[PDB]
Amino acid sequence: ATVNQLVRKPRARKVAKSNVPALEACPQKRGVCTRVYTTTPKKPNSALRKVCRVRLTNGFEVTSYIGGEGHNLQEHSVILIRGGRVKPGVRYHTVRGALDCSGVKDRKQARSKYGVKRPKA
Amino acid sequence: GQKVHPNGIRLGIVKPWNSTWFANTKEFADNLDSDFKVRQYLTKELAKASVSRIVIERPAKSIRVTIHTARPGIVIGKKGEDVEKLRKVVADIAGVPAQINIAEVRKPELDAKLVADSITSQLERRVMFRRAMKRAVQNAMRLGAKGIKVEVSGRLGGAEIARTEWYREGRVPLHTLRADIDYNTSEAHTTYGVIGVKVWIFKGEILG
Amino acid sequence: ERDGLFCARIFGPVKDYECLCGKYKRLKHRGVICEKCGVEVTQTKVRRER
Amino acid sequence: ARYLGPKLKLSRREGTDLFLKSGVRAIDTKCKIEQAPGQHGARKPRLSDYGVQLREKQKVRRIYGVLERQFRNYYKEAARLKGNTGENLLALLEGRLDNVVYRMGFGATRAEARQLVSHKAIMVNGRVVNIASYQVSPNDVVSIREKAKKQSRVKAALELAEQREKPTWLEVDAGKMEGTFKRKPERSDLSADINEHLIVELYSK
Amino acid sequence: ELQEKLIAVNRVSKTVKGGRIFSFTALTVVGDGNGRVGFGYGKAREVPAAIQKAMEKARRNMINVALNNGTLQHPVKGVHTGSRVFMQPASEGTGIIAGGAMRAVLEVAGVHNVLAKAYGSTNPINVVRATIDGLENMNSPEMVAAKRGKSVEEIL
RNA sequence: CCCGCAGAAGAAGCACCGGCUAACUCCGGCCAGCAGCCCGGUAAUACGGAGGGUGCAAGCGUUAAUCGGAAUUACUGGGCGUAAAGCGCACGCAGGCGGUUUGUUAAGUCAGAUGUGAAAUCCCCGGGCUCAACCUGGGAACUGCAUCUGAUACUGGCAAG
RNA sequence: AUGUUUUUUUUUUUUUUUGAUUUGGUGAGAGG
Numbered sequence: 001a002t003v004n005q006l007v008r009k010p011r012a013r014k015v016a017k018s019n020v021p022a023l024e025a026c027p028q029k030r031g032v033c034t035r036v037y038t039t040t041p042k043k044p045n046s047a048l049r050k051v052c053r054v055r056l057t058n059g060f061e062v063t064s065y066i067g068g069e070g071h072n073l074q075e076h077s078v079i080l081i082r083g084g085r086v087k088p089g090v091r092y093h094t095v096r097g098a099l100d101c102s103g104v105k106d107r108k109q110a111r112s113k114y115g116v117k118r119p120k121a
Numbered sequence: 122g123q124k125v126h127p128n129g130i131r132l133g134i135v136k137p138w139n140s141t142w143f144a145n146t147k148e149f150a151d152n153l154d155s156d157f158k159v160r161q162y163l164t165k166e167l168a169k170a171s172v173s174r175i176v177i178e179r180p181a182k183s184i185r186v187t188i189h190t191a192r193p194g195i196v197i198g199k200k201g202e203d204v205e206k207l208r209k210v211v212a213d214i215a216g217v218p219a220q221i222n223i224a225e226v227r228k229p230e231l232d233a234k235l236v237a238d239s240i241t242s243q244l245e246r247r248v249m250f251r252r253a254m255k256r257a258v259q260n261a262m263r264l265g266a267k268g269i270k271v272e273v274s275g276r277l278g279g280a281e282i283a284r285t286e287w288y289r290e291g292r293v294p295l296h297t298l299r300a301d302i303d304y305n306t307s308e309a310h311t312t313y314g315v316i317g318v319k320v321w322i323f324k325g326e327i328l329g
Numbered sequence: 330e331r332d333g334l335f336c337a338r339i340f341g342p343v344k345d346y347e348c349l350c351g352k353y354k355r356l357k358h359r360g361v362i363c364e365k366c367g368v369e370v371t372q373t374k375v376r377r378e379r
Numbered sequence: 380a381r382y383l384g385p386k387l388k389l390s391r392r393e394g395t396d397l398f399l400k401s402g403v404r405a406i407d408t409k410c411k412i413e414q415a416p417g418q419h420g421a422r423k424p425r426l427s428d429y430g431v432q433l434r435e436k437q438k439v440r441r442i443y444g445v446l447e448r449q450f451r452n453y454y455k456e457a458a459r460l461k462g463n464t465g466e467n468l469l470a471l472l473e474g475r476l477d478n479v480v481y482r483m484g485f486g487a488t489r490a491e492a493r494q495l496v497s498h499k500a501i502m503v504n505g506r507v508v509n510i511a512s513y514q515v516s517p518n519d520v521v522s523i524r525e526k527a528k529k530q531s532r533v534k535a536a537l538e539l540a541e542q543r544e545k546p547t548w549l550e551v552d553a554g555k556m557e558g559t560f561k562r563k564p565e566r567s568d569l570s571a572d573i574n575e576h577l578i579v580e581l582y583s584k
Numbered sequence: 585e586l587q588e589k590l591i592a593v594n595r596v597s598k599t600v601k602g603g604r605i606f607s608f609t610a611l612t613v614v615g616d617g618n619g620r621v622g623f624g625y626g627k628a629r630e631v632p633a634a635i636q637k638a639m640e641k642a643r644r645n646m647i648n649v650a651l652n653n654g655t656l657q658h659p660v661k662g663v664h665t666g667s668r669v670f671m672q673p674a675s676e677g678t679g680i681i682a683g684g685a686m687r688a689v690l691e692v693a694g695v696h697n698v699l700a701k702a703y704g705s706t707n708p709i710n711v712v713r714a715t716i717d718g719l720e721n722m723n724s725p726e727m728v729a730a731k732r733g734k735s736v737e738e739i740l
Numbered sequence: 741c742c743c744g745c746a747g748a749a750g751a752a753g754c755a756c757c758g759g760c761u762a763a764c765u766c767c768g769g770c771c772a773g774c775a776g777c778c779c780g781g782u783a784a785u786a787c788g789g790a791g792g793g794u795g796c797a798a799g800c801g802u803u804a805a806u807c808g809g810a811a812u813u814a815c816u817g818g819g820c821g822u823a824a825a826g827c828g829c830a831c832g833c834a835g836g837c838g839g840u841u842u843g844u845u846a847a848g849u850c851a852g853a854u855g856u857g858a859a860a861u862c863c864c865c866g867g868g869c870u871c872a873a874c875c876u877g878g879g880a881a882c883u884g885c886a887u888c889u890g891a892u893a894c895u896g897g898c899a900a901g
Numbered sequence: 902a903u904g905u906u907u908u909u910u911u912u913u914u915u916u917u918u919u920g921a922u923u924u925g926g927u928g929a930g931a932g933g
C-alpha cells in the first residue's frame with residue numbers, strides 16, 4: 001500500500017485460469033466419443049442428462065454435454081465440442097449439426113443452435 | 122370457523138326476522154319450503170334489479186311479500202305491470218293469494234348485501250378486486266356509516282394459491298349486541314373459481 | 330381550414346395549449362410549431378384578441 | 380438494409396405520428412395510432428429507464444429510416460464534432476440527401492424521397508448523386524434532373540409539402556424544382572418532441 | 585410544476601408468532617427542475633400507500649442546490665454509509681451520465697449534464713442520500729466570494 | 741463512368757420475448773428438456789410447437805480470446821478492533837523519511853532554446869474517389885532522451901550556526 | 902446423554918392530477 005512498499009514489491013495481477021482448458025484457446029475442437037451415457041444431475045434438479053466422454057484431438061479426455069432432444073451419437077463417433085459448462089465436471093457441449101453429430105429432429109425455433117436446416121414449404 | 126353470524130346473534134334485540142309468521146308443527150316445514158321457493162324465484166328474477174331483503178309475512182291463508190330494493194322503477198317497470206306479473210307467480214309458488222309490496226332502499230351504499238352484490242359483479246367483469254373493495258369501503262364511509270368492513274377470499278387475481286384480504290374503516294363492533302351491524306355475503310363465480318365476499322356495515326348503536 | 334378564414338397559424342389553436350392536429354399534450358413546450366400542424370400554442374381566449 | 384414492412388405499425392409502437400405516410404389521409408383513420416401493435420396492444424405498463432431511451436432512439440431512427448450501425452456511426456461523428464452532441468447528431472440526420480429532398484417536397488414520404496435518390500432523379504450541384512446517406516452541405520443546390528421532372532409523383536409531393544409547414548433552413552422553387560440547402564438547421568427549427576439527450580445517454584452506457 | 589420519480593420499491597418482512605408479515609418500502613425523490621430536491625422513504629403494507637407516503641415525505645424537507653446553468657459548479661464527492669459518489673460537471677449536450685438511483689435524483693434536480701460514478705455500495709437509499717449530500721455541499725462562485733471577502737472576478 | 745431496353749420484375753434472414761433485458765399469449769407432466777447467473781411434479785409468459793411481438797439485418801447467433809464493468813492488486817484509486825488483514829515483544833545494519841537560521845552550490849525541480857523523437861497509424865483543419873469506408877496535403881501530437889542558457893521557493897549536497 | 906435428522910420455490914408494482922360540465926340572429930304574441 002505504502003508507495004515505498006509498492007516500489008519494493010509491486011502489485012500482483014490476479015491470474016484467472018480458463019474454465020475450458022481442453023480447448024486450449026480454440027473455439028471448437030474435434031473429438032471421438034469414447035463412451036455415451038446418461039447422468040443424474042445434482043440437487044435440486046431431476047433428469048437423465050445425455051452426455052459423452054470424448055477423447056479430443058489434442059489428447060485430453062473430457063466429458064461433453066449433448067443438447068437438444070435426442071441424438072444419434074454412438075462410440076467412435078467424430079464430434080465437435082464448443083465449450084460451455086452445464087451447471088459435476090461437464091465443461092463442454094457437442095455442437096449439434098457438425099461432423100457426425102446430427103441436428104435435432106422436428107425443431108423450428110432456435111434452429112441454428114441445434115444444427116437444423118430451414119424448413120421448406 | 123371462528124365467528125358467530127352477526128345477523129343471527131342479534132335477531133332477538135336489534136335485528137328483526139325476514140320470514141314473519143306463526144304456524145303449528147304441522148304446517149311449519151311446508152311454509153319454510155314455500156318461503157325458500159319464492160325467495161329463490163325472486164332472486165332469479167330481480168338479479169339486475171338491486172334487491173337487498175325479501176321479507177315474507179303470511180296472515181290468514183294469504184302471503185304478503187315485501188321486496189326491499191334500491192331501484193323500484195326496474196322491479197315495478199310500468200306502473201303495476203311487472204309487480205302484478207310477479208304476484209301471480211308468487212301465488213302459484215305458494216298456493217295462496219299473493220300480495221307484493223316494494224320498499225325503496227335509501228342509500229344502497231350503506232346496505233351491506235347490495236354492496237356485496239356490487240363487488241361480486243365487479244369481480245365477475247374482471248376488475249382489480251382490491252380497487253373494488255376500496256370503492257366499497259370509501260363509498261359507505263362517505264354516506265355516513267359509523268364503520269364498514271369488507272372481506273374477499275379465494276383465487277384473487279386468478280392466483281393458484283388462494284388467499285383472503287379485507288379492508289376495514291371506522292369501527293365495526295361485533296361482540297357488542299346492541300350495535301346495528303348489517304352483515305351480508307355474496308359469491309363471484311369467476312373463471313378461476315368462486316370468490317366469496319363478506320361485508321359488515323355498522324350503522325350505529327341502538328339505545329333502549 | 331388551413332389556411333382559410335378560421336386558420337391555425339394566422340390565429341391560434343382551438344384547444345388550450347394543444348396543437349389541434351397532434352403534438353404537446355402536457356405543459357412543457359408552449360410555443361413550438363411543427364410543419365405538420367402550422368399551428369401556434371397558447372390559451373382558448375387568445376384568438377379573441379388576435 | 381431497409382425496413383420493408385408495415386410503416387404504421389412502427390408509429391403505433393412509438394406512440395407518435397412518425398410521418399411514414401404521405402399525409403393525404405390522417406393517421407387516426409388509417410390505424411389505431413394510440414393502441415400498440417400485436418395481440419397485446421391495449422395493455423400498456425410503464426416502461427423502464429433503459430427501455431424509454433431505447434424507444435426514443437428507435438423513434439428517431441424510424442423517422443429518418445436509418446439502420447443501427449449507420450446510426451451508431453452518426454452518433455460517433457457527432458460526439459467527435461464540437462458543440463452539443465445530440466444537436467450535432469440531429470443536424471447530421473437532417474443533412475442526409477433523402478431527408479433534404481423530403482423537406483423540399485419532392486417526395487411525399489421520406490421513403491419516397493430515398494427511392495427517388497436511388498433511381499438517379501436528384502442532382503446536387505448539377506451532378507447526379509445516388510446515395511441517400513449523402514450529407515448535403517450549406518449552399519449546395521439540389522434539384523430534380525430533366526428526365527424525372529415530368530413525374531406526377533413529384534408534383535403531388537410538392538403539393539403535399541405546400542400544405543405542410545416550410546422549413547426555414549431551406550429555400551425551394553416549385554416551378555424550377557431546385558432547392559438550396561442554405562444552412563445546417565438549428566435545434567429550434569426541428570421538432571421539440573425528440574429527446575436527443577436520451578439517445579445520447581443510451582450510447583453513453 | 586414538481587416532478588417526482590419513484591426510484592425503488594422493496595418488499596421487507598417482519599417475522600411474528602404466526603409467520604411473516606410483509607410490507608413495502610418506497611424510495612422516491614422530487615424536484616422542481618431547479619436547485620430544489622428532496623428524497624422521501626415511505627413504508628406501508630401495500631405498495632401504492634407506501635409510495636404516497638414516500639412522496640409526502642419528499643415534498644417536505646427539500647434542499648436547494650446551486651446550479652451553474654444545466655450542470656454542476658465543480659467536481660464534487662458525496663458519501664453516505666457504503667455509497668460514496670463522485671460527480672463532475674460536464675459540457676452541454678453530454679446528458680446525465682450516471683447510474684440508477686443517482687440518475688433519478690439528478691434528473692429531478694434539473695441537472696442536465698453530468699459525469700457521475702457511484703463507487704462503493706449502490707444501495708439505492710444510501711446512494712441517493714450520498715448524491716443529495718454532494719449536491720448540498722457544492723458551493724457556487726458567488727457564495728465562495730462572499731465567504732472569502734472578494735469579488736467574483738477576483739476568483740474567476 | 742455514361743446512355744438505352746424491358747418489367748415489381750431476380751433479391752430476408754438470424755437471435756430473442758421469467759428477472760437482469762427491449763419484447764406475451766394459447767396448445768402440448770422433476771419427464772422430455774432449458775440455463776450466462778438467479779424453471780419443469782397436469783392451469784409452465786423459463787421446456788417443445790404455434791400465433792403475436794422485440795432487437796439486429798445480408799447478415800444473425802453460438803464458442804474462443806482480450807480490455808471493460810472490477811475502486812475485485814486501488815499510481816490516479818481500497819483496506820487491516822468484530823468482515824481477509826498489525827510480526828508475541830524488542831534492539832538494530834542496509835533502506836526510507838528528517839526541527840530551525842544564514843550563506844553557497846545548482847544535482848532534483850521549473851523556464852526557454854537547440855538537436856533528436858523514421859514514415860505510416862491516432863487526433864485537428866482541408867482536398868480526392870457520386871457518399872462512405874478508402875486515399876490523401878498541411879498541422880498537432882509522439883507526454884521522452886540529450887545538450888546549452890537562465891530561475892533558486894521547495895528537496896538534495898557542502899560550510900557555518 | 903444427544904441433535905443443521907426430511908429439505909423443494911407454497912416466488913418482489915402504484916394509480917398519476919391536469920385542466921370542465923357545455924346553447925347564436927329573424928319574426929309573432931302576452932304581463933307590467
Ligand SMILES: [Zn+2]
Pocket residue numbers: 348349351352353361362363366368
Ligand atoms: Zn403541433
